[PDB]
């Protein structure tokens, strides 16, 4: 079900769930239950449905904390309107497409520099050597991390969000405490000595005396770390593996540089890491996929399953970099849709462009690759490569 087969490849299980009607109540060995929703139409409608809340105040007695919001305290992903509308409007005033555009030259140079620090003709781990350092560098720039704090930031972000498979189970918990204090301290530093980063701009943001609070700023930083590092690291890793697993697609991409933007969207649809949206709670009894779901029940909308729905995408379990249209739901839909669609697309393009220019091949048999044991975030433990 949601064990070894699911961790190695979840899409055959998603196919069974869609074939079974697209909604099922699943239970842990301890009796915690949630509804998994797996068909594109229901996942898309669910994501935006105003009757599906992210606020735990609307959860019922059976709530056990599936697919939690990626931050402590009030944040965009645990609030409904009107409180959500305020935060979104405030943050959108500085998290702008122009900000992302102006970061692209630095992102592209960082990708070239990181890959250039990796030797050729020698097994190298793409994750620790490239796919993790690049987003970590970008999110550090975005949050204005000073150079003296980059080492501690890297260590705690990695322990928090990309743990080793044999990391002590308490280390990531401790990293929550460590990073909360780091982020509180970082906000204080920017409050005193402002720069041109997002955190500084967010502190300056004002709506007729309305401002963002310390807790709101720190919570937003946690959200940025989750999606700007954990999601992006494995978007790159899973994308490279998918390219290596489909040589003909790789050869087409290598022959047509203009294919890259559409190729990244297919790579995202094919194996982006996020399997479920943030848990949702019907504020009323709601018909989902033909089942009347009780108010307050936990509902998991299967983004990854939807991206492989055969009723939308032809041959959905095959990589087709020229797939068109490609209405993948990887960045959400509705009021909570991702702030980072473009940023992710820019970091992915920089990462794949540098890899394509350097040359790369698997250093191991792909069947010997190991996947991290997660329910929500699909990613590789390591990906040994040979660089040109
Ligand atoms: C580039 C870095 C990224 C940043 C800074 C970022 C930022 C955010 C933020 C702030 C939200 C909350 C928006 C809200 O609730 O109003 C969000 C939601 C979301 N992001 Fe991202 N994101 C990034 C990358 C990604 C990636 C790589 C994916 C996966 C393909 C992704 C998928 C999502 C989804 C699905 C949601 C909505 C969750 C839900 O509605 O349950 N994002 N993102």
């Amino acid at each position: 079900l949601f064990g070894r087969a699911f961790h190695v490849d979840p899409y055959p299980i998603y196919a069974r769930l869609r074939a079974g009607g697209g909604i099922r109540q699943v239970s842990t060995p301890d009796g915690a239950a949630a509804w998994v929703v797996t068909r594109y139409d229901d996942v898309r409608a669910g994501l935006a449905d105003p009757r599906l809340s992210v606020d735990r105040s609307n959860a019922g007695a059976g709530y056990r904390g599936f697919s939690l919001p990626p931050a402590l305290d009030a944040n965009l992903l645990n609030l409904d309107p009107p409180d959500h509308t305020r935060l979104r409007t405030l943050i959108a005033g500085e998290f702008t497409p122009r900000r992302v555009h102006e970061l692209v030259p630095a992102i592209e140079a960082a990708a070239r520099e990181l890959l250039a620090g990796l030797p050729s003709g020698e097994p190298v781990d793409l994750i620790a050597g490239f796919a993790a350092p690049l987003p970590l560098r970008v999110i550090g720039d975005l949050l204005g991390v000073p150079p003296a704090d980059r080492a501690r930031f890297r260590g705690w972000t990695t322990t928090l969000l990309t743990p080793g498979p044999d990391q002590p189970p308490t280390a990531a918990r401790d990293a929550v405490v460590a990073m909360h204090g780091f982020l509180v301290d970082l906000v204080a530093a920017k409050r005193a000595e402002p720069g041109h980063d997002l955190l500084s701009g967010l502190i300056a943001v004002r709506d007729d005396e309305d401002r963002l609070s310390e807790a709101e700023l720190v919570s937003m930083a946690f959200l940025a770390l989750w999606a700007g590092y954990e999601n992006l690291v494995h978007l790159i890793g899973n994308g490279v593996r998918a390219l290596l697993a489909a040589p003909d697609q790789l050869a087409d991409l290598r022959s047509d540089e203009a294919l890259l933007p559409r190729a990244i969207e297919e790579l995202t649809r094919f194996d982006q890491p996020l399997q479920w949206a943030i848990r949702r709670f019907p504020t009323r009894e709601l018909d989902i996929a033909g089942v009347e779901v009780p108010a307050g029940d936990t509902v998991l909308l299967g983004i990854a399953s939807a991206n492989h729905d055969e009723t939308v995408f032809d041959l959905p379990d095959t990589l087709d970099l020229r797939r068109d249209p490609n209405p993948h739901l990887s960045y959400g839909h509705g009021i909570h849709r991702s702030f980072g669609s473009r940023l992710s697309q820019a970091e992915a393009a920089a990462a794949f462009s540098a890899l394509l220019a350097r040359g790369f091949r698997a250093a191991v048999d792909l069947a010997d690759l190991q996947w991290q044991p997660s329910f929500r975030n699909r990613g590789l433990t390591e990906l040994p490569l040979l660089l040109g």
Side-chain angles (χ1 to χ4, degrees), residues 282-334:
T283 61
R284 56 158 295 158
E285 196 161 35
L286 215 57
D287 188 0
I288 301 173
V291 165
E292 284 184 288
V293 168
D297 268 22
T298 302
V299 168
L300 301 188
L301 301 170
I303 290 160
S305 185
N307 286 349
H308 283 240
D309 195 332
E310 68 278 0
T311 75
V312 180
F313 313 91
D314 181 67
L315 300 184
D317 307 318
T318 299
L319 185 80
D320 180 358
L321 300 180
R322 310 192 164 270
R323 178 176 315 261
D324 203 31
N326 186 0
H328 73 81
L329 296 182
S330 310
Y331 294 106
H333 173 239

Side-chain angles (χ1 to χ4, degrees), residues 55 74-76 79-89 216:
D55 186 334
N75 63 86
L76 285 170
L79 290 179
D80 303 319
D83 292 358
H84 173 261
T85 299
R86 174 182 155 275
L87 280 193
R88 183 107 182 174
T89 296
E216 291 171 336

Side-chain angles (χ1 to χ4, degrees), residues 171-184:
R173 171 200 65 185
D174 302 342
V176 177
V177 184
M179 177 70 66
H180 187 258
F182 180 90
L183 286 180
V184 159

Side-chain angles (χ1 to χ4, degrees), residues 76-77 84 88 95 227-228 272 277-278 280 330 336 338 340 343-344:
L76 285 170
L77 284 173
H84 173 261
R88 183 107 182 174
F95 208 142
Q272 62 94 20
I278 307 304
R280 304 256 212 277
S330 310
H336 291 288
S338 177
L343 195 42
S344 164

Side-chain angles (χ1 to χ4, degrees), residues 25-29 31-125 127-165 167-190 192 194-207:
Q25 179 170 83
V26 295
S27 80
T28 64
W35 298 92
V36 286
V37 180
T38 47
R39 293 179 182 191
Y40 186 97
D41 295 333
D42 306 304
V43 171
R44 194 187 148 286
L47 283 170
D49 197 326
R51 299 162 301 175
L52 270 182
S53 64
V54 288
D55 186 334
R56 67 184 186 278
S57 71
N58 297 311
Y63 181 58
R64 301 286 310 270
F66 288 88
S67 187
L68 303 151
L72 295 152
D73 228 328
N75 63 86
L76 285 170
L77 284 173
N78 71 5
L79 290 179
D80 303 319
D83 292 358
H84 173 261
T85 299
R86 174 182 155 275
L87 280 193
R88 183 107 182 174
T89 296
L90 289 182
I91 290 141
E94 295 302 320
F95 208 142
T96 58
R98 176 98 46 95
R99 195 173 275 276
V100 173
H101 173 82
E102 293 177 339
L103 284 167
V104 169
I107 297 172
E108 299 192 327
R112 296 190 294 268
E113 289 156 17
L114 281 169
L115 204 63
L118 293 184
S120 310
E122 168 174 324
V124 296
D125 172 32
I127 316 291
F130 189 52
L134 170 60
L136 203 42
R137 163 69 201 293
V138 177
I139 204 58
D141 291 9
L142 197 67
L143 297 181
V145 180
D149 296 313
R150 292 264 165 153
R152 71 171 65 199
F153 178 71
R154 297 200 316 261
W156 279 128
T157 308
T158 52
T159 298
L160 178 67
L161 296 176
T162 49
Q167 180 168 279
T170 50
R173 171 200 65 185
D174 302 342
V176 177
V177 184
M179 177 70 66
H180 187 258
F182 180 90
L183 286 180
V184 159
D185 294 350
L186 184 58
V187 163
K190 293 314 192 242
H196 295 293
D197 58 283
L198 187 55
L199 225 45
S200 299
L202 286 181
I203 288 151
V205 143
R206 297 294 201 260
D207 164 62

